[PDB]
Amino acid sequence: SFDELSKIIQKVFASRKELLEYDLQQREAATKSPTFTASQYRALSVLGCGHTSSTKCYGCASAVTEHCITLLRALATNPALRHILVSQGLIRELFDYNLRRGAAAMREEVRQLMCLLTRDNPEATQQMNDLIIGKVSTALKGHWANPDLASSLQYEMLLLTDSISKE
Amino acid sequence: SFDELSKIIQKVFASRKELLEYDLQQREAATKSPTFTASQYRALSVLGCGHTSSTKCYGCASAVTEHCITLLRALATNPALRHILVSQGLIRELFDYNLRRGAAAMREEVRQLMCLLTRDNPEATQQMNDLIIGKVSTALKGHWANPDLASSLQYEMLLLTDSISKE
Ligand SMILES: [Zn+2]
Ligand SMILES: [Zn+2]
């Protein structure tokens, strides 16, 4: 159903573009019987029409989150930028949201970024350790009445392993 | 592999039974050249040899839990036995262990038994409601950082629905 919908939507878009181009040409012909700069021509014409994503799109938001993770990983290699980022409160945001969401590669990249953010900062390391210990203790308190609590700590323990493995 | 193992184990058991019977017959023949009662004959002979389950068996423990649930459901229909059972502390045991384990029929039967145990007891109803509310609040506190917490409340809410639906 999605494939048929996409085909029909593309056909409709092509038809709309052709119709609007013809209307613009006819209007210009009627008017010829105003200078535009190079950027204004692109803005007005049909050239800048079909490269914008929908506002409520899951895939596009996922892609933007991937780009944000990549850019933040690049930025964190500067110690001053690392300090500013950890002062923004990025560690808790990455812990609550991006640890468990996305492809496996993205999850490992988020783990690497979280490890890098605490490379030589005792306060950031203490904060991350507090988050991990709190989650593990809260899960282990009710593990006995619900085993999924004990079996849904793999990412916290993986984060601990990754942080320790980097001397 | 399990099927082949079971076949070989059955063959070994049959061979052992034949050998032991022959040894008993030979010993009796040698001794004939002590009265036993009817129950003692069965105890001694090979008749009472192959009807005992292994101590560490998962399926047999599951079956015993099923029988316990059925017997307790039968017993709870007496108000005095119901009061004694709820005084034993059965509601918490059923809530913590048997709500999520077993086949779907067993789970629904456990829900029915838990509903029946609080049929006209304000204290038992308050205890069950406290358990449900506490679990739901604890899960909903960390629902934001972990959605499995929000999606693993189906049995508590089913229990609440079943308890309410019975006037
Ligand atoms: Zn999109
Ligand atoms: Zn068995």
Three-class HEC string of chain B: CHHHHHHHHHHHHHHHHHHHHHHHHHHHHHHHCCCCCHHHHHHHCHHHCCCCCCCCCHHHHHHHHHHHHHHHHHHCCCHHHHHHHHHHCHHHHHHHHHCCCCCHHHHHHHHHHHHHHCCCCHHHHHHHHHHHHHHHHHHHHCCCCCHHHHHCCHHHHHHHHHHHHCC
Ligand 1 is a single-atom ion; what residues have CB below 5 A from it? A 53, 57, 59-60
Q: Does residue A117 contact residue A86 with C-beta atoms inside 8 Å?
A: yes
Distance CA B146, CA A99 (A): 10
Question: Do the Cβ atoms of A152 and B142 come within 8 Å?
Answer: no
What 3-state class would DSSP assign to A55?
Answer: coil
Q: Which residues of A touch B152 (CB under 8 A)?
A: 146, 148
Contact with chain B for residue A95, Cβ under 8 A: yes
Of A96, A97, A145, the CB nearest to B96: A145
Tell me which of B93, B140, B141, B149 to substitute to probe the interface with A (most A C-beta atoms closer than 10 Å).
Answer: B149
Q: How much distance in Å is there from the Cα of B33 to the middle of ligand 2?
A: 44
Cα distances (angstroms) measured from residue A70 to each of A14, A58, A63, A75, B124: 35, 19, 11, 9, 55
CB B105 within 8 A of CB B69: no
- Cβ-Cβ contacts under 8 Å, B146 against chain A: 100, 152
Write the residue in B97, B145, B148 that is nearest to A96 by C-beta. Answer: B145
> Which chain A residues touch B138 with a CB distance below 8 Å?
142
Q: Supply A50's token pair.
A: 């079909």
Residues of A in contact with B145 (CB under 8 A): 95-97
Q: Which residue has the tokens 């490992």?
A: A108
Hey, what are A128's tokens? 């991350």
Q: Do B148 and A144 touch (CB under 8 A)?
A: no
Long-range contacts of A9-18 (CB under 8 A, 24+ apart): A13/A50, A17/A46, A17/A49, A17/A50
Q: Which of residues 10-69 of B touch A (CB under 8 A)?
A: none
Q: Does A134 touch chain B (CB under 8 A)?
A: no
Q: From residue B115, give the alpha-carbon distance in Å to each of A75, A106, A119, B96, B163.
A: 58, 46, 55, 15, 5
Residues of B in contact with A146 (CB under 8 A): 100, 152
Q: For residue A148, give the nearest of B142, B145, B152 by CB distance.
A: B152
Structure method: cryo-EM
Q: What is the CA radius of gyration of chain B?
A: 26
